[PDB]
């Protein structure tokens, strides 16, 4: 799921409380479509509602579908609310709180998002941007290795429980380590910003168990999203629970902090990328992958759907075979996920070509994917004992009404239904003959 | 040898036009049904010994 889907199901009060922070409003505005942004900007400096027809006349008739979609999305997000214009007309005006916060974020005004940074002076143990990036990469690699099950990576108990609640890994028995499921493989194949966003969404969903304020967590996350890289921020000014949540972020690599009691925290590159690098995989027409990577995580991920051939100290040469792709699919990974992963990790050299990946390789992978699903199997019960067409039609209509029909053929008067509905169909058939 | 070749080249021409159907029809012509326990009915094919067991409502 995406941000818009998550925000659609929230109550109006929660949405209004979210708009109280300028950082949240900017993120919501950037998540809007291109057409919606122009409407928001035009209505930013308006103190009076506008007629619905006047707004509808801005976009041409041919692109009315995009206008309708944008209007529906804005109404669902409650960015604007319809106003009862005098004379029976309907006026459209943006939410005053959202508009005020957006103007504060853009034009200026009010207090800063962070309390202060120069009160405590320069950090005694400050790090650099490459160090923060290395720390974030190490944390993410440790998390993903713990997802795989490598003993070298050990995380906190609550983090492991969160993965179990997310369904990526299941713990069949207490004490024994959980096993990664197909959903875990799909999560691994996802892009890093997508993985971070999915993990944050799962955290937000499970936050209701801990009784934490969703609005505060969302506002803090959005503030971290726009935070400048390499600049510390004041820990003070936050509730006790949020700091605890921040500690979990410290385990996730999004936020770096020297000590729990330290008053300085440095947002990392991964935290910035959460709101939204060059790729290290070269794909050749002969079904060969050349990866410029050294960490065991990427090697394992590539070996999930490919056969390894050579491992030079700074290079990995692998071959994409039919058997490897079939094994990966049997593991639960679809071809679309593999193609997306290859495109995301594609080397910058391959970006020169008009297609990111050669069409032949993608077509071959997709065809290999369809090989497993070529045969369709449906367990059920077949009825072929119809003496008359009229009797067959009534039973077929009853089965369709029950919604247990699998296959119908009026030409030969043969039908196939689910075993669960077989008892109901038999009871219906007996009643028709007995009552006759 | 030329005489043998020129008669062989037309020997099989008439032969190839004799046979018409190659695939053998495998229609299952079941005989009378046999009633077993639990309302089971079994039909035995007289062409290949094929057996079909079903339940009649």
UniProtKB/Swiss-Prot annotation, chain A:
GO BP: any one term: nucleotide-excision repair
GO molecular function per UniProt: ATPase activator activity; double-stranded DNA binding; RNA polymerase II general transcription initiation factor activity
Cysteines paired by S-S bonds: none
Predominant localisation class: nucleus
Record's function text: Component of the general transcription and DNA repair factor IIH (TFIIH) core complex, which is involved in general and transcription-coupled nucleotide excision repair (NER) of damaged DNA and, when complexed to CAK, in RNA transcription by RNA polymerase II. In NER, TFIIH acts by opening DNA around the lesion to allow the excision of the damaged oligonucleotide and its replacement by a new DNA fragment. In transcription, TFIIH has an essential role in transcription initiation.
Domain text: The C-terminus (residues 305-462) stimulates the ATPase activity of XPB/ERCC3.
Membership in a protein family: Belongs to the TFB2 family.
Protein name: General transcription factor IIH subunit 4
Lineage of origin: Eukaryota, Metazoa, Chordata, Craniata, Vertebrata
Curated annotation (Swiss-Prot), chain B:
Subcellular location per the Swiss-Prot or TrEMBL entry: Nucleus
Result of changing residue 28 to R: In XP-A; mild form
Tissue: Expressed in various cell lines and in skin fibroblasts.
PTM text: Ubiquitinated by HERC2 leading to degradation by the proteasome.
Domain of life: Eukaryota
Disease listed for this protein: Xeroderma pigmentosum complementation group A: An autosomal recessive pigmentary skin disorder characterized by solar hypersensitivity of the skin, high predisposition for developing cancers on areas exposed to sunlight and, in some cases, neurological abnormalities. The skin develops marked freckling and other pigmentation abnormalities. XP-A patients show the most severe skin symptoms and progressive neurological disorders.
Oligomer status and interactors: Interacts with GPN1. Interacts with RPA1 and RPA2; the interaction is direct and associates XPA with the RPA complex. Interacts (via N-terminus) with CEP164 upon UV irradiation. Interacts with HERC2. During NER binds XPD/ERCC2 and XPB/ERCC3 of transcription factor IIH (TFIIH), bridging the 2 proteins.
Family recorded in the similarity comment: Belongs to the XPA family.
Function in brief: Involved in DNA nucleotide excision repair (NER). Initiates repair by binding to damaged sites with various affinities, depending on the photoproduct and the transcriptional state of the region. Required for UV-induced CHEK1 phosphorylation and the recruitment of CEP164 to cyclobutane pyrimidine dimmers (CPD), sites of DNA damage after UV irradiation. During NER stimulates the 5'-3' helicase activity of XPD/ERCC2 and the DNA translocase activity of XPB/ERCC3.
Protein name: DNA repair protein complementing XP-A cells
Origin species: Homo sapiens
Higher taxonomy: Eukaryota, Metazoa, Chordata, Craniata, Vertebrata
């Amino acid at each position: 799921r995406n941000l818009q889907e998550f925000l659609g199901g929230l109550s109006p009060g929660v949405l209004d409380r979210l708009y109280g922070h300028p950082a949240t409003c900017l993120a919501v505005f950037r998540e809007l479509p291109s057409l919606a942004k122009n409407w928001v900007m035009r209505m930013l400096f308006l103190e009076q509602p506008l007629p619905q027809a006047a707004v509808a006349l801005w976009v041409k008739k041919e692109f009315s579908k995009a206008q309708e979609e944008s209007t529906g999305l804005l109404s669902g997000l409650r960015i604007w609310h319809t106003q009862l214009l005098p004379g029976g007309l309907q006026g459209l005006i943006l939410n005053p709180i959202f508009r005020q916060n957006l103007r504060i974020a853009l034009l200026g005004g009010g207090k800063a998002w962070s309390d202060d940074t120069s009160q405590l002076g320069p950090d005694k143990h400050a790090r650099d941007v490459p160090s923060l990036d290395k720390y974030a990469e190490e944390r993410w690699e440790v998390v993903l290795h713990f997802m795989v099950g490598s003993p070298s990576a050990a995380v906190s108990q609550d983090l492991a429980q969160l993965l179990s609640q997310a369904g990526l890994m299941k713990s069949t028995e207490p004490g024994e380590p959980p096993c990664i499921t197909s959903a875990g493989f799909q999560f691994l194949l996802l892009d890093t910003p997508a993985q971070l966003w999915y993990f944050m969404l799962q955290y937000l969903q499970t936050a209701q168990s801990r009784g934490m304020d969703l609005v505060e967590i969302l506002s803090f996350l959005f503030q971290l999203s726009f935070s400048t890289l390499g600049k510390d921020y004041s820990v003070e000014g936050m509730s006790d629970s949020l700091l605890n949540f921040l500690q979990h972020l410290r385990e996730f690599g999004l936020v770096f902090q020297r000590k729990r009691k330290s008053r300085r925290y440095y947002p990392t590159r991964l935290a910035i990328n959460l709101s939204s690098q060059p790729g290290f995989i070269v794909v050749e027409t002969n079904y060969r992958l050349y990866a410029y990577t050294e960490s065991e995580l990427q090697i394992a991920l590539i070996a999930l759907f490919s056969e390894m051939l050579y491992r030079f100290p700074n290079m990995v040469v692998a071959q994409v075979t039919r058997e490897s792709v079939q094994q990966a699919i049997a593991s639960g990974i679809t071809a679309q996920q593999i193609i997306h992963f290859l495109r995301t990790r594609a080397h910058p050299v391959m970006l020169k070509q008009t297609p990111v990946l050669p069409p032949t390789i993608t077509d071959q992978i997709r065809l290999w994917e369809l090989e497993r699903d070529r045969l369709r199997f449906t367990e059920g019960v077949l009825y072929n004992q119809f003496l008359s067409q009229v009797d067959f039609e009534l039973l077929l209509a009853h089965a369709r009404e029950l919604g247990v029909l699998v296959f119908e053929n009026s030409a030969k008067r043969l039908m196939v239904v689910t075993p669960a509905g077989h008892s109901d169909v038999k009871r219906f058939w007996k009643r028709q003959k007995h009552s006759s | 040898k030329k005489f043998d070749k020129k008669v062989k080249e037309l020997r099989r021409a008439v032969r190839s036009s004799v046979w018409k159907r190659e695939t053998i029809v495998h229609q299952h012509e079941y005989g009378p049904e046999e009633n077993l326990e639990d309302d089971m009915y079994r039909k035995t094919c007289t062409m290949c010994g094929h057996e079909l067991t079903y339940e009649k409502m």
